[PDB]
Amino acid sequence: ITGTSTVGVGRGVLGDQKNINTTYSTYYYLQDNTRGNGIFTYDAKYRTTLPGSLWADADNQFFASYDAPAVDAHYYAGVTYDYYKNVHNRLSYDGNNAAIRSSVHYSQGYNNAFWNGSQMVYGDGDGQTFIPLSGGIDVVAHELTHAVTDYTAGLIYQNESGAINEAISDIFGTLVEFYANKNPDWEIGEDVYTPGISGDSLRSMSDPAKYGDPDHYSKRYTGTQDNGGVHINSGIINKAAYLISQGGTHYGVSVVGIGRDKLGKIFYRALTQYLTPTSNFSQLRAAAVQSATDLYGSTSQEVASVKQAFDAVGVK
Ligand SMILES: [Ca+2]
Ligand SMILES: [Ca+2]
Ligand SMILES: [Ca+2]
Ligand SMILES: [Ca+2]
Ligand SMILES: [Cu+2]
């Protein structure tokens, strides 16, 4: 909408108070004009029609329970923008300040959240398996990262290219969680998964096995469900990403970690300059190595760690 930029205040899903960029024209809208061509958050009103209606509020205060998922969807979309801009010099997901639009309250009891090719969509969860999923900054940054993948490598959402796609989203979602520096970790979704149970998550990057996902190529899922295990085989790449950053010994293979910034730089470069829609695991290895080579030289520690990490998970 046309109006003037202002700042509202509210509480997100986990009861935390934050300021949000809004726009005033009769009502206060969840429209942030300070980032790119804008960040826009909508109410799907428990239906599945999208995007629904631009979020409008009478007093610029967002403290109702109904408001909380919108507050976080909006705020975290902004933190993700900031991550990509400040860290990778990328402006929004298309690199040209594309508007970011999010819908919350999608359907009833919907235990998931997703980028749909045009915008972000967040269910409220059923209150047992999940609380409103925009409560999880890694969840938000994960799904927004599929937009970045759509506009760069274009990794097809199936089999190994699909698990790479997933892995990439897990990797930048986590790096965004670390950048926000709020109880960061290498698990995915812990802030909104199973409010009844402490310390679990959807999956783990540091030890995928913890939730049944493979941590070695030999343990790869080979069937046809989950689009050829895209959310399963990502464990293999996630493990590799984790070892490159934090290092470790895995199946008797030892990796010297080089830290999160370099991991980010190496995988951002691999994603935007070397991966393709049908890249497989082996190709990702060649892409991460070449990226590290571009960045630190063929005989650097960075390249050696990349080589060791993929060896440790069995990806030659
Ligand atoms: Ca209000
Ligand atoms: Ca966390
Ligand atoms: Ca996390
Ligand atoms: Ca839990
Ligand atoms: Cu995903």
Swiss-Prot record:
This is Thermolysin. The lineage of its organism: Bacteria, Bacillati, Bacillota, Bacilli, Bacillales. Keywords: Calcium, Hydrolase, Metal-binding, Metalloprotease, Protease, Secreted, Signal, Zinc, Zymogen. Ca(2+) 1 binds at residues 57, 59, 61. Extracellular zinc metalloprotease. Ca(2+) 2 binds at residues 138, 177, 185, 187, 190. Ca(2+) 4 binds at residues 193-194, 197, 200. It comes from Bacillus thermoproteolyticus. Coiled coil: none annotated. The chain holds residues 233 to 548 of 548 of the full protein.
